[PDB]
A paper describes a structure:
We also determined the crystal structure of the isolated Claw domain without the adjacent coiled-coil and obtained higher resolution diffraction from this material. Crystals of the isolated Claw diffracted to 1.56 Å, permitting a precise characterization of side-chain conformations and ions and waters of solvation. The isolated Claw crystallized with a monomer in the asymmetric unit; however, the unit cell contains a crystallographic 2-fold-related molecule that interacts through interface-1. Three sulfate ions from the crystallization medium were bound to the isolated Claw monomer at a location distal to the dimer interface-1 but overlapping with the putative FIR binding pocket. These sites are of interest as sulfates ions of crystallization often serve as markers of biologically relevant phosphate binding sites. Sulfate 1 is coordinated by the main chain amide and the side-chain hydroxyl of S1532 and the guanidino groups of R1573 and R1584. Sulfate 2 is also coordinated by the side chains of R1573 and R1584. Sulfate 3 is coordinated by both the main-chain NH and side chain of R1573 and is near the side chain of K1569. As compared to the structure of the CTR, which does not contain bound sulfate ions, R1573 moves by about 4 Å to engage the ions, while other residues in the pocket only move minimally. The proximity of these three sulfates was suggestive of a potential binding site for a tris-phosphorylated peptide segment, such as perhaps the tri-phosphorylated S365-S370 segment of p62.
The formation of autophagosomes requires the hierarchical action of a number of conserved factors, including the upstream-acting ULK1 complex containing the scaffold protein FIP200 and the downstream-acting conjugation machinery, which catalyzes the conjugation of the ubiquitin-like ATG8 proteins to the head group of phosphatidylethanolamine on the isolation membrane. Crystal structure determination shows that the FIP200 CTR contains a dimeric globular domain that we designated the “Claw” for its shape. The interaction of p62 with FIP200 is mediated by a positively charged pocket in the Claw, enhanced by p62 phosphorylation, mutually exclusive with the binding of p62 to LC3B, and it promotes degradation of ubiquitinated cargo by autophagy. The Claw is constituted of a six stranded, mostly antiparallel β sheet and a short α-helix.
Numbering used by the authors: 1494 to 1543, 1550 to 1591
Write the structure that this text describes.
């Protein structure tokens, strides 16, 4: 198995990393688009909400495309930003 870096599909192995700027876990990607880890997947990956672990390997599951409708939001992106929210489970 190899780590996907863009165009994420169900079942892809991915590297989930702590993004300091957004203080949220995101998928490691070469895409300009943000792929945020769904908050419900934190326990699935043994991660804590916000010392935090810098990365973990996971497997892509459900994915949703989103747009920020408010200027200040939980993803810490500007108003109008389009991004993904991805669920993931532990590898193996």
């Amino acid at each position: 198995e190899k780590i996907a870096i863009r165009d994420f599909q169900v079942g892809d192995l991915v590297l989930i990393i702590l993004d300091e700027r957004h203080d949220n876990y995101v998928l490691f990607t070469v895409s300009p688009t943000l792929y945020f880890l769904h908050s419900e997947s934190l326990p699935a990956l043994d991660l804590k909400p916000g010392s935090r672990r810098p990365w973990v390997l996971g497997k892509v599951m459900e994915k949703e495309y989103c747009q920020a409708k408010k200027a200040q939001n939980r993803f810490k992106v500007p108003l109008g930003t389009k991004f993904y929210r991805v669920k993931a489970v532990s590898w193996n």
